[PDB]
Each structure stands twice: as C-alpha cells, then as structure tokens.
C-alpha cells in the first residue's frame, strides 16, 4: 500500500527530530513534538524501519495519527484524523 513516496512525504512534513520521535513512538510510545528543520531525503532510517516493521502501513498510519499531522493524514491517508482513528 504505502511506498517510498508516502514515507518521503512524511520526511518532508515532519522534522528530522520528529522522525526520530516516530521511532520512539512505535517503540516506547513517545509522542513528543520537535519544531526542527525538515529533511528532503536524508533520513534513510525511515526506510529501514519501514522494512523492519516499525513504520509499516498500519503502524505508520497510527503513528501519524498520534502525531496528529494533518498535512499527512489528509494527504497520505486522505481523510480526517478521526476517520483514521476508525481504521486503527
């Protein structure tokens, strides 16, 4: 379902630090925000975690819900945050 374009958009929207937070959001359930600079194709870890099973289709969707990033929720998932909830 989700491809490189999806996780690319995630990298564009969320900051490098927030992308690290996604890792910990999957692992330790850490949902902290980090108003930092975004990357334009640098955090390859995102692809590693995607294949690993930490940023999978379902997992990433949940993570982005918990982050509440509407720039992704209504672009990647193309639906309201609440609508996403019902798919979790």
XYZ file of C-alpha atoms in Angstrom:
88
model
C 0.000 0.000 0.000
C 2.459 2.632 1.218
C 5.568 3.202 -0.894
C 8.667 5.404 -0.923
C 6.507 8.375 -1.903
C 4.464 8.003 1.283
C 7.431 7.899 3.658
C 9.051 10.655 1.608
C 6.091 12.940 2.294
C 6.385 12.034 5.973
C 10.015 13.165 5.931
C 9.005 16.396 4.198
C 6.253 17.185 6.698
C 7.855 16.119 9.974
C 11.224 17.375 11.207
C 14.324 15.188 11.457
C 13.850 15.099 15.228
C 10.156 14.271 14.864
C 11.129 11.447 12.512
C 13.334 10.092 15.290
C 10.371 10.548 17.629
C 8.359 8.302 15.315
C 10.833 5.516 16.063
C 10.330 6.013 19.800
C 6.600 6.489 19.243
C 6.492 2.952 17.864
C 8.876 1.597 20.492
C 8.422 3.448 23.774
C 5.212 5.239 22.800
C 6.928 8.627 22.950
C 4.753 11.214 21.212
C 6.779 14.391 21.719
C 6.886 17.207 19.167
C 10.082 18.784 17.843
C 9.853 22.052 15.915
C 13.051 21.486 13.937
C 14.222 21.597 10.322
C 12.750 19.025 7.939
C 14.802 16.845 5.595
C 14.490 16.449 1.827
C 15.614 12.828 1.539
C 18.234 12.185 4.217
C 16.720 10.000 6.933
C 17.122 6.606 5.268
C 16.378 5.099 8.677
C 12.727 5.624 7.751
C 13.056 3.017 5.003
C 14.964 0.684 7.317
C 12.222 0.929 9.939
C 9.591 0.509 7.227
C 11.084 -2.833 6.200
C 11.860 -3.680 9.825
C 8.172 -3.426 10.710
C 8.224 -0.263 12.818
C 6.975 2.097 10.115
C 4.665 -0.346 8.341
C 1.454 0.630 6.554
C -0.692 0.156 9.655
C 1.966 1.255 12.139
C 2.894 4.474 10.340
C -0.786 5.364 10.000
C -1.206 5.005 13.761
C 1.996 6.931 14.460
C 0.920 9.821 12.235
C -2.468 9.806 13.947
C -0.774 10.049 17.342
C 1.384 12.866 15.988
C -1.771 14.424 14.546
C -0.058 15.761 11.426
C -2.934 16.756 9.154
C -0.504 17.581 6.351
C -0.005 13.819 6.153
C -3.310 12.474 7.465
C -5.241 14.310 4.752
C -2.655 13.656 2.045
C -1.239 10.169 2.564
C -4.410 8.774 4.130
C -6.580 11.471 2.568
C -9.034 11.557 5.471
C -9.782 13.280 8.776
C -7.765 12.334 11.858
C -10.958 10.920 13.361
C -11.570 8.891 10.207
C -8.077 7.452 10.618
C -8.873 6.510 14.215
C -11.659 4.234 12.991
C -9.094 2.329 10.932
C -6.834 1.732 13.930
